Design a protein around this ligand. Sequence first.
Ligand code: HEM
Ligand code: HEM
Ligand code: HEM
Ligand code: HEM
Ligand SMILES: N[C@@H](CC(=O)c1ccccc1NC=O)C(=O)O
Ligand SMILES: N[C@@H](CC(=O)c1ccccc1NC=O)C(=O)O
Ligand SMILES: N[C@@H](Cc1c[nH]c2ccccc12)C(=O)O
Ligand SMILES: N[C@@H](Cc1c[nH]c2ccccc12)C(=O)O
Ligand SMILES: N[C@@H](Cc1c[nH]c2ccccc12)C(=O)O
Ligand SMILES: N[C@@H](Cc1c[nH]c2ccccc12)C(=O)O
Ligand SMILES: N[C@@H](Cc1c[nH]c2ccccc12)C(=O)O
Ligand SMILES: N[C@@H](Cc1c[nH]c2ccccc12)C(=O)O
Lengths: 350, 326, 332, 336
Amino acid sequence: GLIYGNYLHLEKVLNAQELQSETKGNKIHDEHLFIITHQAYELWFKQILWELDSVREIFQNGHVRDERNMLKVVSRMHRVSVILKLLVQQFSILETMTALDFNDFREYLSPASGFQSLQFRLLENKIGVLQNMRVPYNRRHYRDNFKGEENELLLKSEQEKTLLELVEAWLERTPGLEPHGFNFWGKLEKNITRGLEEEFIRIQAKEESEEKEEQVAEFQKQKEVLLSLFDEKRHEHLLSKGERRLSYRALQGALMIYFYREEPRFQVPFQLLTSLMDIDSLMTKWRYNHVCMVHRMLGSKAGTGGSSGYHYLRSTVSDRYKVFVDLFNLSTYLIPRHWIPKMNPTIHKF
Amino acid sequence: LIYGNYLHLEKVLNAQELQSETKGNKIHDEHLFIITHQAYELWFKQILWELDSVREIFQNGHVRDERNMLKVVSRMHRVSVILKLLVQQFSILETMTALDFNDFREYLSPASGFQSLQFRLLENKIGVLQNRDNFKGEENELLLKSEQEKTLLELVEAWLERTPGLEPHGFNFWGKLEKNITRGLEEEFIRFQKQKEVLLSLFDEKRHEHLLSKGERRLSYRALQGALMIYFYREEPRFQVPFQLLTSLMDIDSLMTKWRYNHVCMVHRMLGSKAGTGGSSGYHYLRSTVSDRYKVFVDLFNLSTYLIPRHWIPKMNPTIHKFLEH
Amino acid sequence: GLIYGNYLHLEKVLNAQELQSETKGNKIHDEHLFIITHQAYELWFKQILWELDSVREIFQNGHVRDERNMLKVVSRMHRVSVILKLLVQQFSILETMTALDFNDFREYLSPASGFQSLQFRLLENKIGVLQNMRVPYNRRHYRDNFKGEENELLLKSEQEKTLLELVEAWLERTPGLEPHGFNFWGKLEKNITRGLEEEFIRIQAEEKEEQVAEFQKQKEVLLSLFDEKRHEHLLSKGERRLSYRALQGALMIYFYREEPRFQVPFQLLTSLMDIDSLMTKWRYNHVCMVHRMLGSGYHYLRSTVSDRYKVFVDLFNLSTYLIPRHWIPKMN
Amino acid sequence: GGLIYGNYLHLEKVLNAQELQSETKGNKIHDEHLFIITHQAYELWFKQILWELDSVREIFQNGHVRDERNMLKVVSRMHRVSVILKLLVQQFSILETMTALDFNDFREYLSPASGFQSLQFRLLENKIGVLQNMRRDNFKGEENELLLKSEQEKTLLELVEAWLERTPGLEPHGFNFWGKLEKNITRGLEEEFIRIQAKEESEEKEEQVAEFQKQKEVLLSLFDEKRHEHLLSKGERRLSYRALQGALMIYFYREEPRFQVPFQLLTSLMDIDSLMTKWRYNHVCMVHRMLGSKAGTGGSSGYHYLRSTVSDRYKVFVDLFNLSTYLIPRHWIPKM
Ligand code: HEM
Ligand code: HEM
Ligand code: HEM
Ligand code: HEM
Ligand SMILES: N[C@@H](CC(=O)c1ccccc1NC=O)C(=O)O
Ligand SMILES: N[C@@H](CC(=O)c1ccccc1NC=O)C(=O)O
Ligand SMILES: N[C@@H](Cc1c[nH]c2ccccc12)C(=O)O
Ligand SMILES: N[C@@H](Cc1c[nH]c2ccccc12)C(=O)O
Ligand SMILES: N[C@@H](Cc1c[nH]c2ccccc12)C(=O)O
Ligand SMILES: N[C@@H](Cc1c[nH]c2ccccc12)C(=O)O
Ligand SMILES: N[C@@H](Cc1c[nH]c2ccccc12)C(=O)O
Ligand SMILES: N[C@@H](Cc1c[nH]c2ccccc12)C(=O)O
């Protein structure tokens, strides 16, 4: 029958290690580590892509409408974050390479670099990084590197529906947003307004003091910020500046899911939202762990790929790269439990 | 002798007071929040204990007897193993949702991490330079002392200045290097001006001194030479464990920073753009602590800038080769 | 106004470090590491017990009947396993202590040992480690050397309903089992009998002779599932823990995990197995460290790393009865 | 005409190596992809470990280890190996996100392949120094050849052993470590006994007498070479008597500059034994959850077989662990 090595196509996987330093005369030992590490990173990128595309597809073909599929969705998104955790740890292996030893074979790498990784870009795009999110240096050089089939795939990963878009769509349909029905946004606006009013009255009742004038201008801030939730115009504007990415209505669904997460239909949807955030944090921690290491390897030296090196990479560690940055920023609009619109028997049984 | 007593659990496990409970309605997750901070502080105390012992080994002259290097490197390596665990330990508090956090957050004000003594002592003792309003009494004293007593950076500095091979009438490392790099650049020409400007700027002692004042550089010129010496000649028996040490010093900076960052990533989910109870902008202020401003041993990182081809490095004659044996 | 140090009762937490080597006249540096390491473990044991008891109570008081509470239940159990992961990794810190240095203060410890950790014992008990299944130490019972208040506390933790019993009871009410309802078990036996017969008929059509014994073993194993007396017997030998009906609920939740009412239940079951693996991995890392430090004792430890201490063995063993997807009784 | 990332790493090979048997045989099962990637990633890291380990064997085999400027390279690489194994132990957490139920949906397509047929895992076991008694029909052709070479060539065990046998300080007319250690331990015991002969008759004194006699037998058994030879023949010890002395010398005097890095080396070798068994163990915990008591595709009983690989039988460097049986109070260590 079938055999381990053949099953895993190790004729390919373990015959894929060519040390350029060797190829050009003086074999440097640690180059082998350098090569295996990147390869393992790339096997796992492939796997993440496999999970990610499968989940995207579940949204794109409508299967997500059937809630029996949510366990699968969340399991696979959570798997993506478990893999990234491993990927963030994996840097510790390459760190057993001194900059001194790296330097003995680095010259045989130029002009290649990780910038040319097709899979990393597919992953960035499929999650939903937009070109106008990318660092100046990055949004005019990332795609200018690939051709033929590879260019085709990069193109498709920007042209096809991203995780962000697909989640946005499904978030807009979140039960309870319907004005006819539960009218979440209206109640919420009502309760926050009533809530802030009571608060102001409590503060005014206070014995005129140093601490009081503090509470007032502090209250005025919280009122300014909370009420601005309901300013759809401010949202379009923030959208246009790219400080925000989700539609206004999707954002309402997300917050619906936050406040009412313990309702049975919202439990797994809430886990999904948590996973999306986790994936963003891990993606950024990857970038950040990447930066720390490149610093020790290159110092101030420019990259083999022609970027500034340590300084360019440090600018990718930034919320401009957080695809689901909104999901984090909903914590700005957290209110006291009591203000959350109460839930009646019939929308509970729903 | 009994486990509980030995460990003084009568104290350790009776130190958990949920404010939410003290003010009427106990919120479950406050307990997690308390336990996590306590574990962190226990580990801060342990790091302080390793760190002070290493500082003392430099300051009392024992680091001069090289048989103590195994002790030094191990203890420094231990600090980094603890920090590594401390970085991972945020994963526990991340099982608290922002919502649930938001249920007891009100009872915390105005306490915050800003008032953690040990974290401050740790930063000063390593050597973060100031260029405290939260502390007073015996705590304000300790803090002053930790700013005033010699830091890990100063002690390591002194020691690095005494590195074998730097003396000009001896192996004269620094003079040869300048000769070799210069021939090397010239040779390459006949076979650039950017790295040439960059390489040669290493030999500008006064440029160095300038950046020292602005603190964009941190080690003395001499200490910098010693570090470079240990990097290049790291396989020489006397340089092996010292080189491990330099590596650890850099390990500790990355871990410190990874800590600040993991902290930031979690505070971002907890607060969004809410101000911190301690009065910082929150997310944004902590974001600014993730910069080489706080990287005490930047120089060791930045020495990677000046790496050269092996051939250029001043070959070591048997005089000094033998000098560098145990 | 509230201050960090006071809030955290740091006046206690950070004043709880007495090096016995120092108290006896020669401070040995690494005893500090030894003391801090244990205090952190115990701090996390207290947290685990805190989560663990709130969850037992959610079960014991009936709240778990309201399925809105499952997210909270599963989050806390998952959180227990996240702490346990850190605790497993935490041995790496103590592994920076050499056996030679450990040897310089070991004498000052005696007769204290980990055997005396009140919290480690409460944890074992509250999850559901059975006493009559405990490997005896020094020909005696784990509770013997505890006394007074602590002894009572352990008694209570032995007698009070454990996680295992609480989950068991909830598993017995799993929707689907009822004979006059979806009749899960009845249908399962029928579908397994049909599957096997179809399987047998195909094999008729040396490498053939393998499948025959291979089938015969599987036939015997699968059909043994519907033998309740064999179950009851293995129960009493402590080789199974869950009642027969509870088992049915667990297999119900495995097979139909994607059904929305079963999604978070399935996560919980997975968490319970997680907690079992993490406890065992904790005991193993312990063992591996002792070996290097010290060279019963190390023997008793190595003997705890076994399915004797695996409170939810039944959940692992269900994997034995996995069947092809299309044998699973369909849902109307 | 320009080195490119994908060419350099030959991803034309690495990322075209994923063929789901379930897909090949008519119904694709999503999670098989994970099973495959997980295994390929382990094998890339096995290859990397082989690479490090062979280079270190060669520094011993060709004598470069005699020149102590190379010890930093030796320890760094051995340490690198345990860093890789730490990651490989952690990597199970990824496969653990596959439920047994989903695994069950494609398991049938794997028979009769198994990890028993992992060439590299066996090469690894062998080059470290796992003995064939302390335990390959699954192999053929060139692979079977490599396997045999890995059995006959010097293992890291034998190479480390020879080097231990040359540890400075052992020589009888020199520092005479062994003779001094035996003399000092004998005096130390005699004295401590006298101290016990002083104590007033009690149940306590009797417990110290009984304790003493137990220590005394263990410590003095160290200077019994014939006992060591017997145990060696049973395979309960692996190192020669002299290598044993050399390791103890390095333990006791580890802070002496010439012994600092060697000490680090001995620690790494123990690390690597520890991590291998942790690997074997996390593998066991996972396989349990997938199979229960079902027999493996490779033909073993599965969960139950793998459990028996988790034992100091497979610890190549047991002697290094067990030397801590013979720790003595610092006063007794012969001075310099
Ligand atoms: C010695 C180790 C490493 C060095 C010196 C290094 C250096 C760099 C540099 C300088 C860049 C910026 C582009 C350039 O100027 O070349 C870069 C980008 C990149 N590298 Fe690395 N790297 C290392 C390890 C790795 C590893 C292990 C991976 C794993 C796949 C990786 C993947 C990437 C990716 C995906 C980018 C583009 C990231 C972005 O644009 O946001 N690198 N690297
Ligand atoms: C939900 C969890 C946490 C939140 C929301 C949080 C939030 C914050 C914020 C906003 C600050 C800036 C000071 C302020 O404005 O109050 C801060 C500082 C700080 N926090 Fe936390 N924190 C959390 C957990 C922790 C933990 C577990 C520790 C462990 C000891 C910690 C230690 C510190 C330290 C040492 C500082 C001073 C940081 C510096 O000066 O660089 N925090 N934290
Ligand atoms: C140098 C490290 C350690 C050594 C040498 C050691 C040694 C031992 C030994 C020999 C026993 C068996 C009972 C006895 O002979 O007294 C034991 C039991 C135990 N130790 Fe450790 N231990 C170490 C670290 C730790 C740590 C860090 C913890 C964390 C709380 C711990 C907790 C325990 C527990 C809970 C038991 C009882 C285990 C059971 O009954 O299954 N130990 N230890
Ligand atoms: C669902 C996951 C897995 C299952 C069910 C499983 C099952 C088994 C079983 C039953 C055996 C014993 C031989 C047999 O009867 O087949 C075995 C051996 C082995 N497997 Fe796994 N395995 C899994 C994952 C892995 C992974 C990820 C690796 C990494 C390369 C691996 C590598 C090995 C190796 C090297 C052996 C030989 C071990 C020895 O004999 O000491 N397995 N496996
Ligand atoms: N600064 C935090 C408050 C906080 O997290 C905290 C409160 C009391 C004791 C420790 C805390 N954590 C500090 O980093 C906040 O404003 O959310
Ligand atoms: N049986 C142990 C006792 C011990 O290690 C110990 C003593 C005090 C506190 C914790 C300890 N370790 C427990 O596992 C020994 O003989 O080393
Ligand atoms: N599943 C349904 C309803 C829905 C949309 N978004 C949701 C979020 C949570 C719960 C249910 C939903 C749909 O896709 O249209
Ligand atoms: N960009 C790296 C070189 C590099 C890192 N990873 C790579 C992978 C393949 C080729 C080159 C690289 C540098 O400038 O030093
Ligand atoms: N240990 C000696 C010599 C020394 C100083 N700095 C060093 C750095 C590396 C090696 C040796 C040294 C001393 O402290 O004076
Ligand atoms: N919630 C109901 C039904 C129930 C029991 N066990 C379950 C397991 C999974 C799903 C639902 C249930 C109860 O507590 O009785
Ligand atoms: N390096 C020398 C001396 C030596 C042998 N074993 C050692 C152990 C520790 C220190 C030195 C040695 C050799 O290999 O022959
Ligand atoms: N041995 C496993 C199957 C398996 C695990 N890992 C593999 C790698 C390749 C082929 C088969 C396998 C079983 O009995 O279920």
